[PDB]
Structure formats: structure tokens, C-alpha cells
Amino acid sequence: STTYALSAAQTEIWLAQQLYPDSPVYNIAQYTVIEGVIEPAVFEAALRQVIDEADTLRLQFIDSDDGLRQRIGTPAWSMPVLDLTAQADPQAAAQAWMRADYQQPVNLTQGPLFCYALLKVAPAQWMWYQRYHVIMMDGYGAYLIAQRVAYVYSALCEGTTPAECDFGSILQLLESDAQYQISAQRAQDEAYWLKHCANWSEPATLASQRLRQTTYLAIQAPDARRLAQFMTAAMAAYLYRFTGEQDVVLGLPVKVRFGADRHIPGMKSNTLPLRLTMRPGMNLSSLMQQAAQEMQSGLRHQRYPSEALRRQLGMQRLFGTTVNVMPFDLDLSFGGYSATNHNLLNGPAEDLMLGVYWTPGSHQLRIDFDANPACYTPEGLGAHQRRFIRFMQVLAADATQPIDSIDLLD
């Protein structure tokens, strides 16, 4: 059958997994606590169908003598049914089993790239364990998969025929990427991004178990694009007021659009570098304006991948801070029983990732700081989060006040 080339990110993932074959961070993991009755045969059938619909789970990454490639195959898989009701702490035992799974490495040539499992933790409490490899999954795709599985399971339980998936096949993305590889548009994107990162020396960073720290707050003073624009400008201004460097680079993940009308689980976002210059006397207004100008001046070349741009200049990162503004993923129901999704692991982390989580019709925000241990300490990340949020609160109260006239914290 037909084989497709891997992306630059997938090739880097392959090479890093071949370098450190015992590192388990290239596995993202998640679990779904379900408060109700779960019968495992219906769930296994739902997984059987969803794995066929989300064909990124049926990809086989093989090695050749003419290039690393991937193919759509029929990978062998299973779903264990673990019962832990007859033990003292079933929560601890289930978490230990999960931790035992996502801590052992995964071989990419011959081996299972995902893992599904069901656990008894209480008489009416089953947890669905979901592990994937970074080479074929991201968090958004995992949530899409979990939602589709919940819907299909609820449909199969009540005997109804589940509706047709709203997923696009990964082969659409593969063909589009193969045609884009030989694009003249890709050549022009490379030209633009190379002329844009011209005099770009090492960027601004606060770099002095991923360090994760959340903080809930509520600003009283729109859309979800003004929100992300404001958070980008605020993070850049904070880096400029802490490091003293006027030319701040941030990472902005965008969802590339090439013609697909559906979501393709497995298709990842492209993190574009955003360059902001801090002139004296500038305020949040002009910073927002220049950030939007940089966004829409580089959105024309959105498809050029981050990794090709990075190693087309000299590989040690294009940016140290990433802004991820997104609403929460709605809770899912399995057959009529509501479920709560819990992240077990991520792994590949930019040195600092800023995650802002908003809710429709609400003033409450959630600020997450996911950083690299070798670059931050729990006290250093906590002090930075406290300093940035108050600095960001001073920004929201007056968009006309200059950045340099704002006082910083401890």
C-alpha cells in the first residue's frame, strides 16, 4: 500500500525517541472518571469503531532504506478490564497501574502506540485510561476522541445507530502536506519566515514532573481573540519589564486551515513566532495593535512548520514562552452518566507555557504555568505567576498607561 513522509515535528520526535529510548515523556496520558454503570463490552465496541474513524490510531511508522514513512494499517490492540473494588485504596491502586503504564517506553516500529483500559475503583465508578504517543496525537485530538467514544457508547447502549462521525481522515492531511512540501507557496512561506527572523538572537526567557501551577482570578474589563491578543501583549510586556530586552519573541499556536471542513484527530497546531518591539512610552493599546499586525502579517504564511523554520536557521529555540488561550472542553456523558476528564501526563514542554482558560458568560479565568524543571523552580515559577498576574491586572485597568511607568512586585 501507499506510504507517506513524516512531518518535521514527527521526525524530530522519532529521532529523540531513538536517542533516549527509556524516556516516557513522549506519552500523553489522560483518564475519565465516570459516575455510573459501565459495561465493558459496549465500551470495547465503541472503541473498535472510533479507532477506525480516527485513523491516526491505525498509523504504522516503519523504517525503510529510502526514508522514514508511515502507513495506514490494522494495529493489534486490547482493552483490559481491571477490578479493584476489593482493595483498601482502589484510587491509589488504579493511579499506580496507570503510572506503571505511561512510565514504560514505547517502541515506534513494532509496538502499541496507544492504550485503552477500564478500571473498577468503586461499585459505581469506572475510569477510562487513555494513553497516546506524541507522534500521532495531541491534547485536542485526545479530547475529540474521548467525546466521540462517549457519544458512540451512549448510542450503542440504548440500541440506537450512532450518527456518522464529523472527523476527517488523517490521509487528507497527509496528502495535503505532501502536496504542500513541493509548493511554491511553501517556498514563499520559507522565504518570508527567514526574512522575518533575520537578526534574531536568543529570545527573552524567564528560565533561571513538569512545573504546573494554576491560579484563579476574575478581571472585570470581550471576544476570545481580544482575550488572546491581550494575554500575548501582557506576557510580552512582562518579559520586557523583567528581562530588560525590548525585542520579545513569543510562541502562538495556530490551527492551520488548508481546506478540511472537519476536524482531523492527530493534526496538530503550528506554533508561530510573534516578535514584539517595546519602544519607550508604549502602552497596552499600541502593543495590542502591533501584535495584531504581526499576527495578520504572518498568518498568510501560517502553514510553514515551526520545526523546519527552527532547523533551517541553526539548531536553541525560537521562543521560550507560549500563549495558549482556550475555553474549557465541555464535560462528556457516557450513556447518561456525566464524566470528568483528568490529564495524567503531557511531556514535551516548551520552557514556559501560559494557558488561559475562559468560560462562556463568565468573568473567572484560570491561569496555568507549565514550565521545564531545569529552567524554573517551584518558588521561581510561583513568584513569576504572582508577579505577572498583578502586572496583568494593572494593564487591564488602564490600556492608556505606559508600560514603563508600571511598578512590578517582589
Residue numbers in the entry: 7 to 214, 222 to 234, 240 to 333, 337 to 431
Copy out sentences from the published article reporting this entry, exactly as the authors wrote them:
Nonribosomal peptide synthetases (NRPSs) are multimodular enzymes that catalyze the biosynthesis of diverse peptides with a wide variety of activities. The incorporation of an acyl into peptidyl backbone is usually implemented by a starter condensation (Cs) domain, normally located at the beginning of the initial NRPS module, via the formation of an amide bond to the α-amino group of the first amino acid residue, a process also known as lipoinitiation. Similar to other C domain structures reported previously, RzmA-Cs adopts a “V-shaped” configuration and consists of two subdomains (N- and C-lobes) each representing the chloramphenicol acetyltransferase (CAT) fold.
To diminish the reaction rate, we made an additional mutation on the second histidine of the “HHxxxDG” motif37 of RzmA-Cs R148A to create the double mutant H140V/R148A, which finally enabled us to obtain several crystals in the absence or presence of substrates. Thus, the H140V mutation did not completely abolish the condensation activity, correlating well with its role in substrate positioning. Based on these H140V/R148A structures and related functional assays, we propose three potential conformational states (i.e., “unbound-bound-released”) within the lipoinitiation reaction cycle catalyzed by Cs domains. The major conformational changes during this cycle reflect the relative positions of two lobes, in concert with the binding of substrates and release of products.
